[PDB]
Structures are given as C-alpha cells and as structure tokens.
Coordinates of C-alpha atoms in Angstrom, one line a residue:
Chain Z
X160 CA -61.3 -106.6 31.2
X161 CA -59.1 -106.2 28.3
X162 CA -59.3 -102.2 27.4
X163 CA -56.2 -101.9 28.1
X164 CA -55.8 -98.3 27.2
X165 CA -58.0 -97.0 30.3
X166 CA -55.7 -99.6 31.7
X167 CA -52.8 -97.7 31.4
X168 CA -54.6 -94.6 31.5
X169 CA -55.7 -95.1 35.3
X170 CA -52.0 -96.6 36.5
X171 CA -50.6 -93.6 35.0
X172 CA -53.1 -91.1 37.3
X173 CA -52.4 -93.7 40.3
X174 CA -48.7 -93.3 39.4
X175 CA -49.4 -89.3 40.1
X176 CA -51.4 -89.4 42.9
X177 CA -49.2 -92.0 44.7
X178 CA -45.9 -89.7 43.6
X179 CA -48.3 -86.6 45.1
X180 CA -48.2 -88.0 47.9
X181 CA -44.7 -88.8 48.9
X182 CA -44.8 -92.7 48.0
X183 CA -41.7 -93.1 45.6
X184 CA -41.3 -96.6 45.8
X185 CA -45.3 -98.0 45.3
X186 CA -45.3 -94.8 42.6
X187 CA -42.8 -96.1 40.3
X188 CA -43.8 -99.3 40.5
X189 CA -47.8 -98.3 39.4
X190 CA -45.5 -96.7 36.4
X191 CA -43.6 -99.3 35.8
X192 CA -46.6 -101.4 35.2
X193 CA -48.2 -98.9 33.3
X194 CA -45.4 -99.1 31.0
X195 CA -45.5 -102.9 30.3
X196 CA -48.7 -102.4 29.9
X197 CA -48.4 -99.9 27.4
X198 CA -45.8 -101.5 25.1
X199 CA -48.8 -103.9 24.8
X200 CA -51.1 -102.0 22.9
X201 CA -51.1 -99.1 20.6
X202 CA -49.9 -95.4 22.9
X203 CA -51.2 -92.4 21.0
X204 CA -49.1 -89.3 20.7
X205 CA -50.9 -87.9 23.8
X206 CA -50.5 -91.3 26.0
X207 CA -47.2 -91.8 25.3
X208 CA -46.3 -88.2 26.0
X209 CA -48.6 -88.5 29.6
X210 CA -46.2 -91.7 30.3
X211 CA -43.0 -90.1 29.2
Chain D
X17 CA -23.8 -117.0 104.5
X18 CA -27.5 -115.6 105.3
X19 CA -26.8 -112.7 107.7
X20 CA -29.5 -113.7 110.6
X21 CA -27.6 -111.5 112.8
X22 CA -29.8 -108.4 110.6
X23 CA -33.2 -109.2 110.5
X24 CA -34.9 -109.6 107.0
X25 CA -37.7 -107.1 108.1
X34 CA -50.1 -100.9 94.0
X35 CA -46.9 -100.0 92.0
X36 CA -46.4 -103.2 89.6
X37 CA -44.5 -101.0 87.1
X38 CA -42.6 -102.7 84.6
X39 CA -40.6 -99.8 83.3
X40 CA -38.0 -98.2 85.2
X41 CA -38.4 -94.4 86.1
X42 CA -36.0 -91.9 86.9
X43 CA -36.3 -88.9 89.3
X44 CA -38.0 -86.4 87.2
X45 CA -40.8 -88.1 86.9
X46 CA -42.5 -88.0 90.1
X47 CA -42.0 -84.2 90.1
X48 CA -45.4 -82.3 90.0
X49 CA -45.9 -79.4 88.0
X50 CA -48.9 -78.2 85.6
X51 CA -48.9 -80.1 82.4
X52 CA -46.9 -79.0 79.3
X53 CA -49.3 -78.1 77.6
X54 CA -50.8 -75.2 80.4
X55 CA -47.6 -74.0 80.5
X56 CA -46.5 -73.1 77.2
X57 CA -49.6 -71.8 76.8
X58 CA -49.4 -69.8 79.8
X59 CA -46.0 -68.6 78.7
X60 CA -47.1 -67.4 75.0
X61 CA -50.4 -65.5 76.5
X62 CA -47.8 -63.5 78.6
X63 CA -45.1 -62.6 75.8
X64 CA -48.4 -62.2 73.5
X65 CA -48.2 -59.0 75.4
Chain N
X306 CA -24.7 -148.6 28.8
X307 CA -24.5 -152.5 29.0
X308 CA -26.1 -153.9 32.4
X309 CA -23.1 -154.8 34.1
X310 CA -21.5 -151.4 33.5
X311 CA -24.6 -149.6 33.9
X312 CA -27.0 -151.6 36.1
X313 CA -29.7 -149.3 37.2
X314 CA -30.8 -146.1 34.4
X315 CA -33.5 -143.8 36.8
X316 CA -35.3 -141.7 34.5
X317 CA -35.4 -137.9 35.9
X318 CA -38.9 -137.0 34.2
X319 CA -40.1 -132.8 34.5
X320 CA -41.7 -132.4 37.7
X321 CA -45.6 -133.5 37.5
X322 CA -48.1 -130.9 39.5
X323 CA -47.3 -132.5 43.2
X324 CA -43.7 -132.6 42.3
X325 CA -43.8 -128.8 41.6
X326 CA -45.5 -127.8 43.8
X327 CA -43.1 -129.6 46.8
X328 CA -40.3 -128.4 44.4
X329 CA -41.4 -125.2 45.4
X330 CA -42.2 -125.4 48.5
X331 CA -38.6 -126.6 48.9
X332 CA -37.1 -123.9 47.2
X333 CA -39.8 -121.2 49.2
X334 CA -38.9 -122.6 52.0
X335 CA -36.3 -119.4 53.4
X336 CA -38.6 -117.2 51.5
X337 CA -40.9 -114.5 53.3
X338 CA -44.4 -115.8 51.4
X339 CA -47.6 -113.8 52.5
X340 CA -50.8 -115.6 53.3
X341 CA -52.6 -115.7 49.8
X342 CA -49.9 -117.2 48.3
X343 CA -51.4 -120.5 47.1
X344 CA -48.3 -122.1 45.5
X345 CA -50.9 -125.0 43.6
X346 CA -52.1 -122.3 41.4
X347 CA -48.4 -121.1 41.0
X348 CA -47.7 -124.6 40.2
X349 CA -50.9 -124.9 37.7
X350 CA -48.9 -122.1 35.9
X351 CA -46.1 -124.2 35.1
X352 CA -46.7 -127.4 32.9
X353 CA -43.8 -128.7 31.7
X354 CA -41.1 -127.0 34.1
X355 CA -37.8 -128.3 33.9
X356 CA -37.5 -128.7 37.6
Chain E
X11 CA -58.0 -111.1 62.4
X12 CA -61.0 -110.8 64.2
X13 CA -61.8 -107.3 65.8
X14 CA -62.9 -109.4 69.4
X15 CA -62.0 -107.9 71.8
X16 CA -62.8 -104.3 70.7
X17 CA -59.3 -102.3 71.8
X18 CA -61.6 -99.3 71.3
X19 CA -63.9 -100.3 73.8
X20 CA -60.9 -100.2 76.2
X21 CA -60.0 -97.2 75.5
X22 CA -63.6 -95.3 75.8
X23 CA -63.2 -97.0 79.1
X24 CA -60.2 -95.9 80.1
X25 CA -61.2 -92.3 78.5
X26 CA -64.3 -92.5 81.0
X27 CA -62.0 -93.4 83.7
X28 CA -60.0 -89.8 83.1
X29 CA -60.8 -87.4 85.6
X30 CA -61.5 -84.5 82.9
X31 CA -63.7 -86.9 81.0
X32 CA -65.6 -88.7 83.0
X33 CA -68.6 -87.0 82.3
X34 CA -68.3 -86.6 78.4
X35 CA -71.2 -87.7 76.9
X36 CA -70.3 -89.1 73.7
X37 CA -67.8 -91.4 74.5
X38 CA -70.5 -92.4 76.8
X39 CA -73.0 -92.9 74.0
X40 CA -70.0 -94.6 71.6
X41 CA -69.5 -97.3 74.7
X42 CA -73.3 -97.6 75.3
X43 CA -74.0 -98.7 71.4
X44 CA -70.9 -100.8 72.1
X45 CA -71.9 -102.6 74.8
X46 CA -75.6 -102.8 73.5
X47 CA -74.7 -104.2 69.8
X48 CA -71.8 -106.4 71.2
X49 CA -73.7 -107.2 74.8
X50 CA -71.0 -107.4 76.8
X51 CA -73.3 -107.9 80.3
X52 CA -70.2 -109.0 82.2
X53 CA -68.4 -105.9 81.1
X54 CA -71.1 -103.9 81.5
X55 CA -71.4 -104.8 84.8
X56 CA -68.1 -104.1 85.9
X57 CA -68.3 -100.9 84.6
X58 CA -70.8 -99.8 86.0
X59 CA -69.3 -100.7 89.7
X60 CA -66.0 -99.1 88.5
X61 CA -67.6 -95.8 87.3
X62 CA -70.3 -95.6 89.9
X63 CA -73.3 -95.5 86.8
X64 CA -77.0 -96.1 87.2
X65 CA -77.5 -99.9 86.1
X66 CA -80.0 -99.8 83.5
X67 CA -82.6 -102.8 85.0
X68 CA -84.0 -103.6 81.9
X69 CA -81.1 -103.1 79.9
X70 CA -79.2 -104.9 81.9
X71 CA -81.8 -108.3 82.2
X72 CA -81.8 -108.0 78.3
X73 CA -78.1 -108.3 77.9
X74 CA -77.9 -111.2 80.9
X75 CA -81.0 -113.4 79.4
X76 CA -79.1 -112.9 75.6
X77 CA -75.9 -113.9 76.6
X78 CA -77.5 -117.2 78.7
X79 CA -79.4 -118.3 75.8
X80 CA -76.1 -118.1 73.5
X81 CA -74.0 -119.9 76.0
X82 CA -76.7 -122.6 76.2
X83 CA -76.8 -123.1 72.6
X84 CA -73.3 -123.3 72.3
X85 CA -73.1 -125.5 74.6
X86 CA -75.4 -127.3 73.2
X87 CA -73.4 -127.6 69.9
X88 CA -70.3 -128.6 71.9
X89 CA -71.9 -131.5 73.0
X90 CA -73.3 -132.5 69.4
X91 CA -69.8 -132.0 68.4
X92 CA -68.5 -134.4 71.2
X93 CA -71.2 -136.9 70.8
X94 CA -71.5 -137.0 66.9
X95 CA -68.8 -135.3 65.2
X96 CA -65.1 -135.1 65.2
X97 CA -62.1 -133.8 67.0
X98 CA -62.0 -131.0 64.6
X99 CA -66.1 -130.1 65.2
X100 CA -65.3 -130.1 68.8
X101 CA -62.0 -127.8 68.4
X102 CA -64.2 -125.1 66.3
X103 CA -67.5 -125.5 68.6
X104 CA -64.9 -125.1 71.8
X105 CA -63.4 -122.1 70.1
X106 CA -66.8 -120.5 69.2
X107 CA -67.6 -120.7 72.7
X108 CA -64.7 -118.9 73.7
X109 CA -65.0 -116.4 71.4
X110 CA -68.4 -115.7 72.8
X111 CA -67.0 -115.4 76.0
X112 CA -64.5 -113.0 75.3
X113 CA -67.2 -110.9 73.2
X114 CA -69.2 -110.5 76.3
X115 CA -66.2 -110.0 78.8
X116 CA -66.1 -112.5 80.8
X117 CA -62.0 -112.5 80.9
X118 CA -62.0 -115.3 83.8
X119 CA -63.6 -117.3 81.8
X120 CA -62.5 -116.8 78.2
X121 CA -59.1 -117.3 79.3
X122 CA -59.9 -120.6 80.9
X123 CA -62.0 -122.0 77.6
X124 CA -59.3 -120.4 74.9
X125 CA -56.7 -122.6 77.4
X126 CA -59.0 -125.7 77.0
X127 CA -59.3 -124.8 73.1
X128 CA -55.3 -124.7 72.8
X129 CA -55.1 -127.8 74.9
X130 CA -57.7 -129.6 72.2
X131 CA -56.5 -128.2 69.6
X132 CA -53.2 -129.7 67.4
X133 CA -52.9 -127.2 64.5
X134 CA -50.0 -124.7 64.6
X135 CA -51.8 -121.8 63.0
X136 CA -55.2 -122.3 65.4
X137 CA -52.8 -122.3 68.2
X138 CA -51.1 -119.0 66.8
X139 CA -54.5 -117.7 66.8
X140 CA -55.8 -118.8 70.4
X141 CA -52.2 -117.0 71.5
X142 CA -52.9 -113.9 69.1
X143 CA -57.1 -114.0 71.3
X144 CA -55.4 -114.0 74.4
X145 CA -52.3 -111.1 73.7
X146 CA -55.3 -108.8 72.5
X147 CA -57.7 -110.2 75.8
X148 CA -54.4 -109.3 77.6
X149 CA -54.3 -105.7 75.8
X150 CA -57.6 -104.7 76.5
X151 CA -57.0 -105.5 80.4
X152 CA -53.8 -104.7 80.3
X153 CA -52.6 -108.2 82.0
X154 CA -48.7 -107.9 82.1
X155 CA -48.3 -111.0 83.2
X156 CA -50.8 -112.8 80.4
X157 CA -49.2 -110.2 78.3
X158 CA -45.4 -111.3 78.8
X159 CA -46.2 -115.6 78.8
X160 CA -48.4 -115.5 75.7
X161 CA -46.1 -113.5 73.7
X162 CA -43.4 -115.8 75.1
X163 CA -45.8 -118.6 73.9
X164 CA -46.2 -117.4 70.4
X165 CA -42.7 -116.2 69.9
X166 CA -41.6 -120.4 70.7
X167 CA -44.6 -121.0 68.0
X168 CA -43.5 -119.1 65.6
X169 CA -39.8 -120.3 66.3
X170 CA -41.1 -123.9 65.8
X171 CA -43.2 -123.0 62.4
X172 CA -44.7 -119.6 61.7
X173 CA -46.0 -117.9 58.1
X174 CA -44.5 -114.6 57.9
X175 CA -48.0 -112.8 58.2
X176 CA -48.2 -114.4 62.0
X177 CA -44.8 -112.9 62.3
X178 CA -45.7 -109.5 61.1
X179 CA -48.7 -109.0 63.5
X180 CA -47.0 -110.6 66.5
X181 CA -44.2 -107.7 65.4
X182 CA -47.2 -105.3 65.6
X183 CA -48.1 -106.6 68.7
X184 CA -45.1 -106.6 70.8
X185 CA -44.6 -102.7 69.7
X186 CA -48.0 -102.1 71.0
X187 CA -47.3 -103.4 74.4
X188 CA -43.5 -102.0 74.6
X189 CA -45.1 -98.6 73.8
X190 CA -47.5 -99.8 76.9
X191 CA -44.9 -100.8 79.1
X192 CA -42.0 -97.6 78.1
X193 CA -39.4 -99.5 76.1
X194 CA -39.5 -96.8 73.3
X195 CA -36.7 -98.4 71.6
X196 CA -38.0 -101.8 71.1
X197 CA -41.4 -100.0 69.9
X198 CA -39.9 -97.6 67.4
X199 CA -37.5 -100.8 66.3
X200 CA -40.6 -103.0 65.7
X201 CA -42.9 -100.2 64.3
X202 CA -40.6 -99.1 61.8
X203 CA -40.1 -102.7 60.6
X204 CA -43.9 -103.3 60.1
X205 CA -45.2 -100.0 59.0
X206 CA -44.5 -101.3 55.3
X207 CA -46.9 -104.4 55.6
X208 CA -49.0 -103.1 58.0
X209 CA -51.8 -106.1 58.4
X210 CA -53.1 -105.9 62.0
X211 CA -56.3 -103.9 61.3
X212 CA -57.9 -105.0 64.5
X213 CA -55.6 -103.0 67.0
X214 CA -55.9 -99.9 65.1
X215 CA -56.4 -98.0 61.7
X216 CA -53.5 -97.5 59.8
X217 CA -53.3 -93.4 60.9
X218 CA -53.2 -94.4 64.2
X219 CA -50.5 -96.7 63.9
X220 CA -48.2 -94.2 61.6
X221 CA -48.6 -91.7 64.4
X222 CA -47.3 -94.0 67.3
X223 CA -44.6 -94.9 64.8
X224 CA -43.2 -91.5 64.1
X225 CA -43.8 -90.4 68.1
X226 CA -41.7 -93.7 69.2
X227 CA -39.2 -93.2 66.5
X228 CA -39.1 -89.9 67.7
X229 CA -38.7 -90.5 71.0
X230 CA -36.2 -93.2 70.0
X231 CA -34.5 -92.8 67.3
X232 CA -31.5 -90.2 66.8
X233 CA -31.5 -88.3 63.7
X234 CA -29.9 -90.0 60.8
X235 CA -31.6 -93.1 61.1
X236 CA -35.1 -90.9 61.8
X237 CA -34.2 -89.0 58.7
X238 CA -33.7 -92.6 56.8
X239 CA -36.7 -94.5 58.1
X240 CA -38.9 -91.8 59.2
X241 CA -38.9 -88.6 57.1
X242 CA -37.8 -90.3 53.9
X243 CA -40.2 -93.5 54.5
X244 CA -42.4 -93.7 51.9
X245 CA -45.2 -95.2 54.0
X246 CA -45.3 -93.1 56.9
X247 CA -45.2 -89.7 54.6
X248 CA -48.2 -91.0 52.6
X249 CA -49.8 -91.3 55.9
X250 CA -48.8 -88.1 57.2
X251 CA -50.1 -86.3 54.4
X252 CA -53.9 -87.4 55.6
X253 CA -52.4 -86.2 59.1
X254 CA -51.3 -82.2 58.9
X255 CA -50.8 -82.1 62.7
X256 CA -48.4 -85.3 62.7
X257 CA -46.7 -84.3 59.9
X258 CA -45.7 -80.8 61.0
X259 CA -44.9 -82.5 64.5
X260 CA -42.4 -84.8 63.2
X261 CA -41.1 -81.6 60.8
X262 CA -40.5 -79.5 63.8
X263 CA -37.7 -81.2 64.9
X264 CA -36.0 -82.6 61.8
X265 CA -35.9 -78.4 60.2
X266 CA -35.7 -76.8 63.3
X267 CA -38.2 -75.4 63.4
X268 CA -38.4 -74.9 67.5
X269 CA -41.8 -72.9 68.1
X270 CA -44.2 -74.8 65.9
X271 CA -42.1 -77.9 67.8
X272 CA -43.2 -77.1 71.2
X273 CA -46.8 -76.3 70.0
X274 CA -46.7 -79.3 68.3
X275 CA -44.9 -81.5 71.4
X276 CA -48.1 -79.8 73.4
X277 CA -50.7 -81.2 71.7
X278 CA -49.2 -84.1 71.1
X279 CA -49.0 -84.7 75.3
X280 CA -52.8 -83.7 75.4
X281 CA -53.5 -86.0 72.8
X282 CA -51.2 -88.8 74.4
X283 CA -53.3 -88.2 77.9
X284 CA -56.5 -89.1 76.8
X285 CA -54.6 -92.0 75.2
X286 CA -55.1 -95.2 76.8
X287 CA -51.8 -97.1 75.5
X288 CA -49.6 -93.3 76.2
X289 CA -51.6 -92.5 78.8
X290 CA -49.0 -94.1 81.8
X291 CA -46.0 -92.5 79.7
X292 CA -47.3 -89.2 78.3
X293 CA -45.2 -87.0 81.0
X294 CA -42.4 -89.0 80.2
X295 CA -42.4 -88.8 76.2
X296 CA -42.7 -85.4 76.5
X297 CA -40.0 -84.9 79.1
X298 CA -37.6 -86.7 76.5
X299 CA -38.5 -85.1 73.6
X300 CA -38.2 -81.9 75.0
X301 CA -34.1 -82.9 76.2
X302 CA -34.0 -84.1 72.6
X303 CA -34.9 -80.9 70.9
X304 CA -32.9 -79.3 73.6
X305 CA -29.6 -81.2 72.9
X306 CA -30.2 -81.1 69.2
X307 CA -30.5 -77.5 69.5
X308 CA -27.0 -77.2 71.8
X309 CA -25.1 -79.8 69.2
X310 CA -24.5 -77.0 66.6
X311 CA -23.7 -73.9 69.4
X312 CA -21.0 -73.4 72.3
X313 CA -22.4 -71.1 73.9
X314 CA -25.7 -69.5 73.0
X315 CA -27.8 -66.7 74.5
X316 CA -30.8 -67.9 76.7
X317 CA -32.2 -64.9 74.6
X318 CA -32.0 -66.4 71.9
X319 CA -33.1 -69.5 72.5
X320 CA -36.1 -68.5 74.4
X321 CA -37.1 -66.5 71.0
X322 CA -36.3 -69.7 69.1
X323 CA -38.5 -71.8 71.4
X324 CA -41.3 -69.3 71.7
X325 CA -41.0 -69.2 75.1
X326 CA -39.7 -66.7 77.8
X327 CA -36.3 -66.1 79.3
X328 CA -37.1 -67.6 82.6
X329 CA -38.5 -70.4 81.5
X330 CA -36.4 -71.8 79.5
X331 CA -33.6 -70.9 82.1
X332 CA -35.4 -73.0 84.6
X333 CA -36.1 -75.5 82.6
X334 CA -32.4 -76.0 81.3
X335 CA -31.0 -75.8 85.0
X336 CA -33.9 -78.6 86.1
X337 CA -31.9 -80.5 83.0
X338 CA -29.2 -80.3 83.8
X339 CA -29.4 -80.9 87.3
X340 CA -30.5 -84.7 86.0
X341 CA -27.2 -84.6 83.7
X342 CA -29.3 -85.0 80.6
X343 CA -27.9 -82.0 78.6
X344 CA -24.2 -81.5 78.3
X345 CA -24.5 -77.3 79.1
X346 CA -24.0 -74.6 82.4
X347 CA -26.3 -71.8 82.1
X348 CA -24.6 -68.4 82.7
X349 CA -26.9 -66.4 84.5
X350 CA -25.7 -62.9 84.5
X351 CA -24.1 -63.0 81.2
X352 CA -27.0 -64.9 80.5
X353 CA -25.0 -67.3 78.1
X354 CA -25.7 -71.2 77.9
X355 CA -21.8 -72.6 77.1
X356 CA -22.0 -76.7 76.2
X357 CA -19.3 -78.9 78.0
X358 CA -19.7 -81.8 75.3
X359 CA -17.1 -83.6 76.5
X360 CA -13.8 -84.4 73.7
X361 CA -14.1 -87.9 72.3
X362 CA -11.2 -88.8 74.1
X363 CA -12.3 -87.8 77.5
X364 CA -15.6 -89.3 76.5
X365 CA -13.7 -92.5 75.6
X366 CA -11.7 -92.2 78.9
X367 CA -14.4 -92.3 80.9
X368 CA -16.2 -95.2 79.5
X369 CA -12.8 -97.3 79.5
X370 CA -12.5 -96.3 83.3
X371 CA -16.2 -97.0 83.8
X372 CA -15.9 -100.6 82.3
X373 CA -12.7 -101.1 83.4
X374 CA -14.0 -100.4 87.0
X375 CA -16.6 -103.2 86.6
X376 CA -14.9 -105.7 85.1
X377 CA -12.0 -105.2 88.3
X378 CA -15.2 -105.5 90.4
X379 CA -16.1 -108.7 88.9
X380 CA -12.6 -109.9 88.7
X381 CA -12.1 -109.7 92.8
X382 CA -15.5 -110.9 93.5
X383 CA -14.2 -113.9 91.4
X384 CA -10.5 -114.1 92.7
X385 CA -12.2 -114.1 96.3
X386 CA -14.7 -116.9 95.8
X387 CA -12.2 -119.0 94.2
X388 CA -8.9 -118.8 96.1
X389 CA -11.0 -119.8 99.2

C-alpha cells in the first residue's frame, strides 16, 4: 500500500523493539529502511524527531 | 608376522569416554540441593 | 574497416532476457543465493542492461 | 521441509522410556493424539511391546485397516503412474509411498522404498531431499550407521551441486547428531554458523535450537570467542530474552557470577536428562562445565581459600574440597588443595615449561615414528 507515513512509522517501532531486544544488526537495518523511506515523503517535526 | 604362537582369543558408543564417567554418584542436581538445604541452616 | 582488413564485425548487442538471466547466473555463480531467489524476475527488472 | 518423521514423537518416547517418567500422563496423552492423528500402527505397535502397554484392540484394528487401505491406493497410483504416465509421475507416486511409510513407522520399509525412490529418481535436489528423509528417519531411531553414510551421501551431493539453503540445514543437521554422538566442538562450530539463518523448522523451534547453541558453545567454546559469538550474537540474545533461565545460565559464567551458575548448571542437567538428544551426555556436559567454571575461576587466583570459594559457589567447604581433589586426580584443573591451611595454590605451568613439554611430547612421537620407519626400511 502506498501510505507510506505509517510505513515509516511502524519500521521505526520495529527498529525499537528489535534494538529492545539485543538485535543491533537486523535493528539498524529496520532504521535504515525507515530512513529511505522517509526521505521519500513529507517527515513532520514529530516524525523526524522519532527517527532522529 | 601374525604371532600364532599367542592365541587370538551392547556398548556401540561412538564417543570416547574418559574415567569419570562411569563413577556413580547422586545427580548434580540432588546434591547442590542437598548442600544449600544444609548451609540454609 | 574494409573487408580484407576487417573481415568479420560481431555485433555485441545488450543482453536480451535469457542472456541476463545466464549472465547472471554466471556472475551468481560463487554467490550464497537463498531458495526464493528467482533470478528471471531479477532479470525482468533489468531491460536494457549493458551486460 | 516436511515435519515427517515427528522428532517430537521420539522424544515423548524416549521421555516414556525414563525411568522417572514412565508413568507421566501427559506425555502419554501428547504421544496418544500423535499416534492417533498421524496413525503410526507400526509404531504404535512397537511401543506398546517396548513399554509393556495395554494394546487398545479397536484402536489398534482402526490404525491397521487405515494404513492398508492407503498403501493400497498408493499403490494403486504407482502403477497408473507406471502404466500411463511418466518417469517423473512414477518418481512422485514412489516418493508419496514412502513418505507414507515413514509417517506410519514402518522404518524397514521406508528405508527400502526412499532407496528405490533415490535409485528412480535423477534430480539433484529430490535426491537431497530423499538423503535429508532418511538423516531425520535416522534421527528419530537414532541409526548411527544410517546416520554417518547418508550424511556422507549428502555431503558428496552437495559437493557435486548444492543451493546454499540444502547446505544450511545439512549444517543444522550434522550439529544435531554431533550433539547426539558428544563431539561438542563440531556442534557448537556448526550451531554458531547457522543460528543466523536458522531454516530447519522441522527438528526443532527456534528456542530450542538457541539453547543447544549456547549449552554446546558453552561446553565448547573458551571465552573470547563465546564472548564474540555467543553473548554479543545478536541472534541468540534476541532468543534468550524469550528464555530468562537460558539467559541467566549462559550469564553465570561469562560475569562470574558462580551461585546462580551452579543453580543454573543444575537445572540445566535435569532439563538435559529428560532430553532425548542430551540425554546419553547430560553427566558428561555437566562434568565439563563444572571444570570450566572451576578453571576459569582458578585463572585469575594463585592461591585461594576453599572458604572462599565455597561461599562463591554456594556450596560447603567439604564439598567443594572433594570435588576439586576428584579433579584433580583426573588432571583437569591445574591446582593442589591445601588441606590444613585450607588454601587451593594453581601450578599453571610457565609458557615455557608448557612449551617444553609439548616439544618433548611431539618430539617423542615423531622419534617413535622415525625408528619404526628406519627399522622397516633398513631391513
């Protein structure tokens, strides 16, 4: 589906849980993808500083 | 050089064990419990 | 470019779909792939690669 | 892969066949519903001989008179396939058949129609997967000899031509059965590799196989590489933290943290004797782990009061004493226990002595080798 705002939403709180739980590696990756795809779409002040 | 002169005369483990192993003693667990009830006191 | 100089010119055209995909598989071949790897759709991806 | 054989169904057996828990009651229902859903009539059979059970008549005719009518009507397909269709339809219907065979237990004869199957059938990845039947047929019996040629078998397959998925279960597989047969090394080696890619969900959840990883590294591995594979693995920490007891097991050591190490190294031997695949070795991993915490306890003293220790390991004075002379005795730690002083003094020997004695050691062999040679040449 294209909203890609919950998109990056929902990598970001897998990101979290997955660093919560020890698993560096698969975490940053989750970010990293939630980062491409959020400098796809328009982050809000309150995204961007989640992400950040 | 077969040496006739001495005559030539379940357990298929595949792993090699030492010594210690065939001793018999309560299990590990019976004793450190054993030994914490008696310095629980 | 005359032909006596030159006798035979073979044209090297882009790969075509086969000829990607045995490209890479020739390429993939000392590569870990995991089952679920269908290189023809990987292939399908590329039109036009320069080889 | 497909979950036939059950590996769980050999282990309620093999839980059954425990002295403590032969009576238990829910494994017994857990094998019943197994044998029922699955019916395994050949099995059940056997079974019931083994563990002296009541046959259940009509039970029992049920399971018999299903699994004749299935092998009639896959038999009956075979010989469509023969007659009618082609080699392929005959490779599947042949393979079918012996995957019926092997759902019911009949090992004799599963093993005989997955050998016709591989013998009929000219694809490398079927054949992987008749060899992959036959390891986990092998498993649930526990056939060493099946065991050793099939994984011989695959390992040539795979050598010939092999995706890496086939090679990262057969990985998984070959740890299973060095944990089985007490190569601890080769297991940890082979677990550790795989526990990143972990595929092989017919063998055993993905808990399960994170705690035989960390006990085998454990039991295996020294310290820096089971602090760089093991307690900074990204994999096997996720895991853990869905398994507190593991977790705080594998923690013991690694912080020194002896007491809640030997209540841990307990329950993991009870646990490990109700295991079916650790059941043969239990004794043994706990024996070693305890000489591991032991020495890695002794690396950073010279001589340290059996007070002390004892209060560090939770245990009394007399205990550990005896336990560190039987120890000893067996040359496993590098210590003499002072009795009277009661003072434990390590003899870690320099690394030039050390050194010394392996040179002399090898030295000594190679001489050996060098006159048997020098005599069966000069004549």
């Amino acid at each position: 589906m294209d909203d890609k705002a919950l998109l990056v939403e929902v990598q970001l709180l897998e990101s979290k849980t997955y660093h919560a739980l020890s698993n560096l590696p698969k975490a940053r990756a989750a970010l990293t993808s939630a980062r491409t795809t959020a400098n796809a779409i328009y982050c809000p002040p309150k995204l961007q500083a989640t992400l950040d | 050089d077969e040496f006739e002169e001495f005559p030539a005369e379940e357990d298929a483990h595949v792993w090699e064990d030492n010594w210690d192993d065939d001793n018999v003693e309560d299990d590990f667990s019976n004793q450190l419990r054993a030994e914490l009830e008696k310095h629980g006191y | 470019l005359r032909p006596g100089r030159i006798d035979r010119k073979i044209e090297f055209p882009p790969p075509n779909e086969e000829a990607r995909l045995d490209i890479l598989k020739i390429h993939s071949r000392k590569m870990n792939l995991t089952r679920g790897i269908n290189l023809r759709k990987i292939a399908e991806l590329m039109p036009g690669a320069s080889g | 892969l497909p979950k036939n054989p059950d590996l769980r169904i050999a282990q309620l057996r093999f839980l059954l066949s425990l002295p403590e828990h032969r009576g238990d009651a829910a494994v017994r229902d857990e094998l019943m519903a197994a044998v029922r859903d699955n019916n395994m009539a050949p099995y059940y059979e056997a079974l019931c001989k083994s563990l002296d059970w009541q046959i259940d008549v009509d039970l029992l005719n049920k399971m018999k008179k299903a699994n004749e009518d299935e092998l009639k009507r896959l038999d009956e397909e075979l010989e469509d396939a023969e007659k009618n269709l082609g080699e392929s339809e005959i490779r599947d219907a042949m393979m079918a058949k012996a995957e019926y065979l092997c759902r019911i237990g009949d090992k004799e004869g599963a093993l005989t129609a997955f050998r016709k199957t591989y013998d009929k059938t000219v694809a490398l990845g079927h054949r992987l997967d008749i060899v992959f039947y036959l390891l986990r047929i092998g498993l649930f019996y526990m056939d060493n000899d099946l065991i050793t040629r099939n994984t011989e078998k695959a390992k040539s397959l795979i050598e010939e031509g092999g995706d890496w998925d086939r090679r990262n279960r057969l990985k998984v597989y070959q740890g299973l059965y060095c944990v089985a047969i007490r190569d601890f090394k080769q297991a940890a080696e082979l677990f550790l590799d795989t526990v990143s890619t972990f595929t092989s969900y017919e063998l055993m959840d993905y808990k399960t196989f994170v705690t035989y990883t960390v006990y085998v590294s454990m039991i295996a591995l020294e310290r820096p590489d089971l602090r760089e594979k093991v307690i900074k693995g990204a994999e096997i920490l996720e895991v853990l933290h869905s398994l507190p007891a593991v977790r705080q097991y594998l923690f013991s050591l690694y912080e020194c943290r002896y007491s809640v190490f030997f209540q841990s190294l307990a329950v993991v031997e009870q646990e490990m004797k109700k295991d079916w695949l650790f059941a043969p070795h239990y004794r043994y991993y706990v024996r070693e782990m305890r000489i591991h915490a032991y020495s890695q306890l002794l690396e950073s003293y010279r001589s340290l009061t059996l007070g002390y220790m004892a209060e560090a390991f939770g245990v009394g004075v007399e205990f550990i004493d005896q336990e560190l002379s039987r120890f000893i005795a067996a040359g496993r730690l590098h210590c003499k226990i002072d009795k009277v002083n009661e003072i434990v003094e390590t003899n870690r020997p320099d690394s030039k002595n050390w050194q010394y004695q392996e040179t002399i050691k090898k030295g000594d062999l190679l001489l050996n080798r060098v006159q048997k040679l020098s005599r069966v040449i000069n004549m």
